[PDB]
Amino acid sequence: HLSVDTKFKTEGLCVDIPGIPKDMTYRRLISMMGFKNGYPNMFITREEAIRHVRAWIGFDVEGCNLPLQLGFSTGVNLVAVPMYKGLPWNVVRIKIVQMLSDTLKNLSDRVVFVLWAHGFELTSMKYFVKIGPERTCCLCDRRATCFSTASDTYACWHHSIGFDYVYNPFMIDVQQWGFTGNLQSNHDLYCQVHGNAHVASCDAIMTRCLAVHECFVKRVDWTIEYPIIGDELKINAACRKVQHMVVKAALLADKFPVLHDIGNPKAIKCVPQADVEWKFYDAQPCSDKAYKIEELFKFTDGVCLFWNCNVDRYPANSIVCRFDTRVLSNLNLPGCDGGSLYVNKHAFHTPAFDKSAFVNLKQLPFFYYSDSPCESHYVPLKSATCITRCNLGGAVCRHHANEYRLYLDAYNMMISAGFSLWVYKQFDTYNLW
Ligand SMILES: C=Cc1csc(CNC(=O)c2cc[nH]n2)n1
Ligand SMILES: [Zn+2]
Ligand SMILES: [Zn+2]
Ligand SMILES: [Zn+2]
């Protein structure tokens, strides 16, 4: 945890707060913010913030004493008076709780406000924030993130309906990391997808994007592990199953003499009984721009497997699994320059999906293939895509009907999680019969 006696640089704040001391600790800062047990500091370290990336909410307040525009990286702008029209703080804070609860309940057990701090945002916290000792929800065992003055009760993000204060938020000022120049000039160095439209929400979006760029694009820590909040395990199991299925059938159908497996340096053979000559080539997850095939690269013999090795243009003799950054899920967070921050056990920033990368390939059709014995150890199954000896013979046996439906469920899970599959144009399932 971050010592409250650590120094906070105040130069960023001196425009909204003329005369602010240069010599400043977090202790004195919190006191100036109007605030006074498991919550040692409202501010956290970059390391703590990285561990709670899912909780990150970029936050900016803009002035014109007169009204204030509060912007958040969700896209919401609220106007408080002492896009939405001006309203007093006692109704504004109700909206802040509802918005953070709906955004974060399926993501994290807290909120981390990510700031490019110039003053108003920090002096505005006293109007919708309360702090105190760590607590638990009144209705469950999750830690409390909201408080209600109507009933003097605490709630987590799931049980906060009607609550009016944010309780024990965390926060981090990006301007402490040692930057030169304003927010827009540092953000626009790495990103063109987020504009500067002179609304507070635009600043909040840029601030979070810059943070993510610094902590996951330029710097990368794959040792950090993140809790399970979803179907992580079923998704990862489904990916290994689809990988085995698709490569096995591609070898059986086209009988490539060699396979170039390009990507993770710890990859293992996904079809260990295949006759082919299996050759590995090491590349780590690219976090910034897609690899250039010319730098990566007889790759024109046999087939190339690119299983989450994002390249700019796949060769024509490839099998490919590429993550689609546009997908909406609790695992996939907005990232930098169209990229997305996929957090499933580990945090993988991923360059933006680009359909031109697949120009030499086609989409891979669903199919189930099996050469296993028809032995069991219900509604009868009818499908043209169940490629088994039994379907060839007229009637799908029960074992293969069960496995087909399991494989379809895993296939559909992996697609819905954002993954997309692409194959060489000559792939043809008829060749497997
Ligand atoms: C209603 C009060 C109010 C205050 S400021 C504002 C509009 N926001 C900006 O001009 C701005 C500058 C940087 N980001 N946003 N509205
Ligand atoms: Zn609860
Ligand atoms: Zn950006
Ligand atoms: Zn069968």
Numbering used by the authors: 26 to 61, 67 to 94, 104 to 121, 153 to 367, 376 to 455, 465 to 520
Text taken from the publication that reported this structure:
Non-structural protein 14 (NSP14) is the main 3’ to 5’ proofreading RNA exonuclease (ExoN) of SARS-CoV-2. Point mutations in the exonuclease (ExoN) site of non-structural protein 14 (NSP14) compromise the fitness of betacoronaviruses like SARS-CoV-2, implicating NSP14 ExoN inhibition as an antiviral strategy. However, there are no advanced compounds that inhibit NSP14’s ExoN activity. Building upon the reported crystal structures of two fragments bound to NSP14’s ExoN site, we identified a series of 3,5-disubsituted pyrazoles that bound to and inhibited NSP14 ExoN.
Because XChem screening uses “PanDDA” analysis to identify density from even weakly-bound fragments, we sought to validate the binding pose of the XChem hits by bespoke crystallography using a small set of newly synthesized analogs of **2**. We observed identical binding poses, and unambiguous ligand density (confirmed by Polder OMIT maps), for all four fragments. We also validated the presence of two conserved hydrogen bonds to NSP14 (Asp273 and Gln108, **[Fig fig1]**). Neither **1** (pIC_50_ = 3.4 ± 0.1, n = 4) nor **2** (pIC_50_ < 3.3, n = 5) potently inhibited NSP14 ExoN in a biochemical activity assay, while the isopropyl thiazole **3** (pIC_50_ = 5.6 ± 0.2, n = 4), the alkyne thiazole **4** (IC_50_ = 3.8 ± 0.2, n = 5), the alkene thiazole **5** (pIC_50_ = 3.6 ± 0.3, n = 5), and the cyclopropyl thiazole **6** (pIC_50_ = 4.3 ± 0.3, n = 9) were more active. We confirmed on-target activity as recommended by others for NSP14 inhibitors by demonstrating that **12** and **13** neither bound to substrate dsRNA (by thiazole orange competition assay, **[Fig fig2]**), nor inhibited the unrelated endonuclease RNAse T1 (**[Fig fig2]**). The unmerged fragments, **3—6**, were also clean in these two counterscreens (**[Fig fig2], C**).
